[PDB]
Amino acid sequence: GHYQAEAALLQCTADTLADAVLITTAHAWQHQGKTLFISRKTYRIDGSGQMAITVDVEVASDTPHPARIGLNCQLAQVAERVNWLGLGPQENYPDRLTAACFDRWDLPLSDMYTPYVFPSENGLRCGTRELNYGPHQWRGDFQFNISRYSQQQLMETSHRHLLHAEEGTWLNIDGFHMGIGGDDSWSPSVSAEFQLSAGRYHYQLVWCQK
């Protein structure tokens, strides 16, 4: 039920500190009475203009290891360029990133999507400490992809030529992402060390304007 799990709110509170507002949330993801994932977050917005997102995730040990652990949203802004400090410049995944180099990369938005004829998750970059897109900047230690196509459209469309740019830009920011495998393509092939099996996961992100 990973694809049809629904977020059930467990907690949502606000607090006022000396220099910041602090939002605390908790969600459970559930399918047919079973809790798959729990996400606990803090959003700390301070006087500088920065939002610090702290995420801790629990994953039931008896559910198949999830493909990713991160956040996504659809930004209204469409910009020409994507600028990042992390692995690149090309698409790289945790078990296919040895060729990528850590540096400051800057590509047109289109180069951030890989036109696989049969569409799937694509264009991820790993080891990213900073991502700039229009007026937005994200900082932390994460993996991301950014494009005009939702994960939903990608999995529903059988051929690349049938895809249509959605309004604005879909961003996927992952603390953690599963390997892609490939030793063969007809049996599970992602090695154990690249499966998200640690049960508890922590990542932090800082969102701001430049």
Ligand X SMILES: O[C@@H]1[C@H](O)[C@@H](O)OC[C@@H]1O
Q: Which is nearer to Na ion, 88 or 119 (CB)?
A: 119
Helices in 73-190 by DSSP H: which ranges? 151-156
Residue 58 contacts a second copy per CB under 8 A: yes
- Residues 86 and 103: their CA atoms lie apart, in Å, by 6
Is the peptide bond between 108 and the residue preceding it cis, with omega within 30 degrees of 0?
no
Give me the phi and psi of 112, to 5 degrees please.
Answer: -90, 0
Name the nearest CA neighbour of 153 among 81, 72, 76, 84: 72
- Pick one of Na ion, ligand X, a second copy, none as the site partner of residue 58 (Cβ within 5 to 8 A by kind): a second copy
Q: Is 48 in the site for a second copy (CB under 8 A)?
A: no
**Residue matched to tokens 């289109």:** 110
Point out which span in 47-55, 93-101, 116-124, 196-204 binds Na ion (CB under 5 A). Answer: 116-124
Determine which residue in the list 32, 62, 184, 188 makes contact with a second copy, applying CB under 8 A: 62
Q: Going by C-beta distance under 8 Å and a sequence separation of 6 or more, which residues neighbour residue 199?
A: 58, 59, 61
7 binds, options a second copy, Na ion, ligand X, none, Cβ within 5 to 8 A by partner type: none
- List of residues contacting a second copy (CB under 8 A): 8, 10-11, 13, 15, 17-18, 22, 28, 35, 38, 56, 58, 60-62, 141, 200, 202, 204
- List of residues contacting ligand X (CB under 6 A): 155, 186
